[PDB]
Structure formats: structure tokens, C-alpha cells
Design a protein around this ligand. Structure first.
Ligand code: A1ATF
Ligand code: MG
Ligand code: MG
Ligand code: MG
Length: 133
């Protein structure tokens, strides 16, 4: 399947009416995973200008909390695993595959403007791969 380029606004600066809806610079996002095809979710508070791999890193921080990792161990774990996953907008064929502040992706900026909760699916990066012809 082909993969579209990031669906982003032209600049990372927020228009003032959107900036002023931030909560101390932060937003809340819901991250879903398929585990049976049963679903599980995390709800995470993040800086609005976190890039997609930093969202994945924060999910890794939550998933590994019971391991009582040091910061150095968590960094090692994040470096090993964050690149194995990708974020997709729930309900459509749009992914967050490049380094932009999350609030520059049009879906997220729209969610902030509307006071809607972004819902994202965390998937294996291999789900994107095409077979060579
Ligand atoms: C193999 O999992 C798919 C990839 O998952 C991840 C990869 C990177 C960062 C976070 C996760 C991740 N993990 N667990 C999540 N909820 C979850 C909680 C408990 C279980 C059962 C168990 N653990 O006994 C299974 C689960 F799924 C969630 C929810 C949102 S992100 C995420
Ligand atoms: Mg404030
Ligand atoms: Mg949660
Ligand atoms: Mg979906």
C-alpha cells in the first residue's frame, strides 16, 4: 500500500487562539494498541510539541514502569524499541512518520482547536512494508 507524506501545517507556530487552549504547554492523547485483536489504551499527557518518537518513548516509559528502570536503562530501552513502532490516526490511513511537533500534524492541531481528544494507534513499523515486485 502506498504511504502518504505527513499531513502537517506549514509552520510549527500555533495561531494564538489554538496556543491559548494549551494547558501549561501540554495536551492529552489516547494511544491504542491491538493485543485476539483485543484493544488496550494509554492516556498520556505530553508537551504539545513532542515529536512522534517522543510520544512512543513516553508510552515505553509507562509500559516498563514496573521494571524500576534507571534513567540510563530507560534511555537504552527507548533507543532499542522506539523505532520498531509507528503512530497512526485512528480511523484513517495517515501516519506520523516524520519529525514534526505533534501539534503541527493537522489532526492534532484540529483536536486542540476543538477540545477533542486525539486517538492514535501504535502499530509495528513492519505493517507499512510492501513486498518487492
Ligand atoms: C506488544 O505490544 C504492542 C506494542 O506495545 C507497546 C509498544 C511500545 C510502547 C508501548 C506499548 C504498549 N504496551 N502495552 C499497552 N497496554 C497493555 C497493558 C497490559 C497488557 C497485558 C500485559 N502486558 O501483561 C498488554 C497491553 F498491550 C499499551 C497501550 C498503549 S501503548 C501500549
Ligand atoms: Mg497555560
Ligand atoms: Mg492509562
Ligand atoms: Mg485505526
Amino acid at each position: 500500500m502506498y504511504v502518504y507524506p505527513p499531513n502537517v501545517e506549514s509552520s510549527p507556530e500555533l495561531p494564538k487562539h489554538i496556543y491559548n487552549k494549551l494547558d501549561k504547554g501540554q495536551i492529552i492523547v489516547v494511544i491504542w494498541v491491538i493485543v485476539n485483536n483485543d484493544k488496550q489504551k494509554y492516556t498520556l499527557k505530553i508537551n504539545h510539541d513532542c515529536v512522534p518518537e517522543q510520544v512512543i518513548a513516553e508510552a515505553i516509559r509507562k509500559k516498563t514502569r514496573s521494571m524500576l528502570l534507571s534513567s540510563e536503562q530507560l534511555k537504552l530501552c527507548v533507543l532499542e524499541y522506539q523505532g520498531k513502532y509507528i503512530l497512526k490516526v485512528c480511523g484513517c490511513d495517515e501516519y506520523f512518520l516524520e519529525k514534526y511537533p505533534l501539534s503541527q500534524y493537522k489532526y492534532i492541531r484540529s483536536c486542540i482547536m476543538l477540545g477533542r481528544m486525539p486517538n492514535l494507534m501504535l502499530m509495528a513499523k513492519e505493517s507499512l512494508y510492501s513486498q518487492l515486485p
